[PDB]
Write a protein that binds this DNA or RNA. Structure first.
Ligand SMILES: [Ca+2]
Ligand SMILES: [Ca+2]
Ligand SMILES: [Ca+2]
Ligand SMILES: [Ca+2]
Ligand SMILES: [Ca+2]
Lengths: 16, 308, 308, 321, 16, 16
RNA sequence: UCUUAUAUCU
């Protein structure tokens, strides 16, 4: 994707 | 992401995806300290043609003022004791660190790294490039070496020495390698549980410092910032070094855009003229601080420049 | 505030309002460390007559044992390369650090600063005084300088150096300025994300060291502890140096009482006699720690004396 | 009464605590109880690449009669303890010199030359550091006491002018806090020798940071630096490069044990010491192979660690290990 | 006012 | 008894 | 999303 769109997903993982 | 503070979130951004925004969000390190600082965002853009039939070694080290350290060697080989890494400064060095080996802290006194990235954007056409890119990181810390010298009263010398440069001499199981045309993207991260301020060092033009042998220093090879009015080793932050090894066969025309980023927090000196650009480090952002560490452990050693 | 811990509340009290309690409530730092420690509550009271037609510079730096460093210069002038700040100790130095340059850790091995406040309470009458008080804090840190000497076997020298003293050379943009007869009360705050212990240093009487030009040290001036049986620079804490510049015009009869507080946590050595007075550092008080930072942030750089 | 068994190992609710969290406390206060070392890493904020080294020493040791033997358990990576004995009833003098006893695998790890110390590992950080003395004397011929106390010995510098013709100023490494060995500290443990001991150390800082590997230190004070210059009460020689050395100084209070055997005493014990380190491995080193990430923040493991350590006696008898 | 009187106010407001 | 036994009990007490 | 090694705990 983009690195922020990859990063954004990681955060959404363990914030959920 | 409505748990992260406005800055906790800008932190993460500058930290991992600088190239993905119109202008750098970075606004300081959302830890406990909230002292006076100046956040500086150093960027270096460079058109570069990797010399053919050679192995170019680039080091992205947490040395404020200098973007990267490069050297080249015979293809298939690694830096030998006789090799010297030269420094490539980010724009504005003198305006920041002076032009004398002992005037490093006129403007600023200490600093802490908040970010360090790198990206290689191949520029050659599909008929001219050939080689690969390999990345690996290494815990190189700035320690000291103590050795008796044979002066007259008869001394004992204590000098600065880089520890961990030995990991430049081999590509570890944790690396990223691929065709040169694919380019790369990589980040470094804080190599300590906390984010502390590092002092500005005075008089280091080369490491090992002069009038000390490589072998004495114990360094695999040596780093030279060169002439004091041009650059210098003013410190060494808490980030792993990023090793990049560009390899190109004879007849290959491998060119790229080298881009480096480094966001840092400096402790302005009240006498410095950059002071009035200062601000307070932002307040503790427990979530950002955590999310930072897990995102860090979740990314690959590197990624191709198409996803950056 | 009964959301706060008892020891946590004191921490705040000593840190910011020492002169307000009939007895120093401070009882250690409420962070994770909970090991052995003796707390020292250093207080210095000193009548002082500021010389007229001179700018007197006081420095409240985190150097255990000495209350402050003084020096004056021609009015409307800052310290020059040939200036020498002289140490003024807190009562009972020899009892804490001996009377020899390499005998500073017999009693104590380490220390961390809990607080450091300063106060000027003018005692001149409202017809003789003239001039002002100006306060600014600087982030000076104890770093090192490396320089090749020319000894025969020829060596590279590494020696202690203060970085950030160039800040004393101008009034900081963030400062407090006002009539002399209004006095002042200022406080410093830890200059790191946390509270780590610092080591006691041996054999330091003057920074620049001996047999080293002020020019190779890269220091704007010279800090002299003086004779080894009198004082010494036993360490550099993590607090910003509070810089005070008193300034008496010609014919000014400026006199004050210079009070100076510094509360510390030391690591007592089992052989020391102060050991039996020690206790454990108080346990983590997240609230005390958090508020310590914001309180610090919501306070003025300094306040006139009648508001302490 | 009589003597305690010897911990053998590797012989083929409490829910709030994270898995690595629990293993950390376990290794930190009672390694001799487990057949295998639970340790994985320090459950703190750092989650970087590390190889958790698990050092154990099984050392036979005879305490020589009519002397006081001093043992230092200091946070010096690779060497298990520093020993020295003096005339009974006295303490180390400037003249004294503590020689180091290594943990197995020293050269394998730190090389065979003074500037070869960080070839494979760039920095380290202690997780645990414990000692255990299991007396092996008979109940008819032993005599003496065992005394434990802990000192906050840190590694600082000494700045001193020298008489070099261009004429210079020196700065060398110096151990600060060593005078603590000079007296039984008020907070101590003392008991009959035929009862052994088992004590532990804890991190002496509010957090767990990485110390750097140090190059070229063999003796401390370094050569061509006298013992009076360095301001130390005695010396620490690590011997020959090829043998050992002082490769760093972590953040752990050093444990001091003084065995005191009167004349005609037959005091011998089995000395066992454990220290769990987290190291930063180098891509070029083979240990790099065994690297893993330091476990994530376990705020409960981290606070409990602090409280448990403060609730434990400075030392405990073997039988109770 | 005095100092404590100043820091108390602050501290009371950031806890509300 | 063991060191871990004691440590375990301590931890429990502090947690509850 | 169930069976398999192993390490965990009241
Ligand atoms: Ca820290
Ligand atoms: Ca080496
Ligand atoms: Ca300077
Ligand atoms: Ca530190
Ligand atoms: Ca001493």
């Amino acid at each position: 994707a983009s690195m922020w769109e990859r990063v954004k997903s990681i955060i959404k993982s363990s914030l959920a | 992401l409505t748990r992260l503070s406005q800055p906790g979130l800008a932190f993460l951004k500058c930290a991992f995806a600088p190239p993905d925004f119109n202008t750098d969000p970075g606004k300081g390190i959302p830890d406990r300290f909230e002292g006076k600082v100046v956040t500086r965002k150093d960027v270096l853009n460079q058109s570069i043609n990797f010399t053919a039939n050679r192995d170019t070694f680039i080091l992205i080290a947490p040395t404020p003022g200098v973007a990267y350290w490069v050297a080249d060697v015979p293809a298939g080989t690694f830096p030998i004791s006789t090799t010297t890494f030269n420094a490539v400064n980010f724009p504005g060095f003198n305006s920041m660190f002076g032009n004398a080996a002992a005037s490093r802290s006129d403007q600023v006194s200490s600093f802490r790294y908040a970010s360090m990235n790198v990206g290689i954007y191949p520029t050659s056409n599909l008929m001219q490039f050939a080689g690969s890119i390999t990345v690996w990181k290494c815990p190189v810390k700035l320690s000291n070496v103590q050795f008796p010298v044979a002066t007259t009263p008869a001394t004992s010398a204590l000098v600065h020495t880089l520890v961990g440069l030995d990991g430049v001499l081999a590509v570890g199981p944790d690396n990223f390698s691929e065709s040169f045309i694919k380019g790369v993207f990589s980040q470094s991260v804080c190599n300590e549980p906390d984010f502390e301020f590092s002092d500005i060092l005075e008089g280091i033009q080369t490491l090992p410092p002069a009038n000390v042998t490589v072998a004495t220093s114990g360094q695999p090879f040596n780093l030279a910032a060169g002439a004091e009015a041009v650059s210098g080793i003013v410190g060494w932050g808490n980030m792993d070094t990023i090793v990049i090894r560009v390899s190109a066969p004879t007849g290959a025309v491998n060119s790229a855009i080298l881009k480096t980023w480094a966001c840092l927090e400096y402790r302005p000196n009240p006498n410095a003229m950059l002071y009035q650009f200062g601000h307070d480090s932002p307040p503790c952002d427990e979530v950002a601080l955590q999310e930072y560490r897990t995102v860090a452990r979740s990314l690959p050693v590197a990624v191709i420049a198409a996803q950056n």
